[PDB]
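FAQ
Q: What does a multi-component entry look like?
A: The components come first, one per line:
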Amino acid sequence: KNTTSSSNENPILRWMSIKMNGFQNELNELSGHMISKIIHSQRLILQ
Amino acid sequence: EHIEKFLDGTYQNSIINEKRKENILIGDSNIIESYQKSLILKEEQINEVRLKGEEFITSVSQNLISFFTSSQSSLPSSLKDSTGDITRSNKDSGSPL
Amino acid sequence: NDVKKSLRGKELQNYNLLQDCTQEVRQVTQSLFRDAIDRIIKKANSISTIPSNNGVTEATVDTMSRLRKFSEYKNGCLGAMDNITRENWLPSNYKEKEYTLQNWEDHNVLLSCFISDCIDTLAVNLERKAQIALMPNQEPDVANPNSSKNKHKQRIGFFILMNLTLVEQIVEKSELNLMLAGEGHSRLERLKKRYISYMVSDWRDLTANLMDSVFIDSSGKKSKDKEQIKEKFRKFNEGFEDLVSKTKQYKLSDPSLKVTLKSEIISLVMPMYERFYSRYKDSFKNPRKHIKYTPDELTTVLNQLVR
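Then the predicted structure of the entire assembly, as tokens:
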């Protein structure tokens, strides 16, 4: 139309871009703590 | 919670917002292409499909802490799910992690 | 108003006829106010079903924007409140328990009196319509949180309190806002607390037969009848999660209603489980396998029952 949308995809880019923030943030956080934990595994097993 | 609380989640009370006429003034001329009806043709299933995106991504996320890392250093286990080496005994490790 | 006030201490002789055709324009007020009440009756009873997502019939929107048409004739409303009864807008076979109303002094009395009585009429007619439309074979029994009849006190409660959500959210910025001071706020509060208590009803069943389950086995010993442990505590968990389950059907709109129903039902439940949990938490090495919640975690459940 566009609209793009009908709130609910513009305002569910409040979902979609922010579900992309839950996803990109999820990879961010798991990336962080996983990276530092494995860093504390070469610390914790090798070192 | 809110995003599920907009699908059926009224989203008609939002139509009741300007359908208070914003009185004053007197109209009541609400011709919004109402609204965001919406989504029943599979875009609701695109929404719940995205929620499967989320809980799925958490499922593979913590499911990466199922291997310990399979017993041992597969430590950089960032990707991906495979290799069920089933030497369960012993410590070093069922741990994960 | 301008002419009968105009300048006095003088001969004024058509002033009687001013009071007579002005007595007919107070039959235009009077007829417009019995028209207001009967307007609520017929214009409300127009609809027959609670809505799809159970919202607000826009006959109520008509009723409140109808009231803001009663608003900005304000000073003519003030003089228009002259010398006329509450029963000059009443279908006389009413009861006053229908009306959250508890003087005869000025027109500011009949201001909040009259308008808040009109929203009481909105309450009794909407309430009647729900009482019909859910149990379509019964007598509509009204204003009754202690009803032994309704099965939909939560549902009717959220319906009606969305109607009042509308009403105070037009008295939000109205002149009625600045008109109906003092009592009429508290009239609206009692109006709320009815349907609030409708949404506390089966929680009062849970607490009711919980502490009754304390009462009937308050006779004998410590619970070697461990069917009483898992009776009170299991069935308490059963009805508790039933109530949390049917709490999920409704999602509130006033934040102060969230605070209201929240702290109400917290204050309903808690001390029972405090003295009762803490009374009977001495029965196993794992009460866990029989008794589930703390008051800490149950409190937390209630505090995220109200997202």
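Q: Is there any commentary attached?
A: Sometimes. For this entry: Helices of chain B lie at 4-7, 13-18, 43-63.
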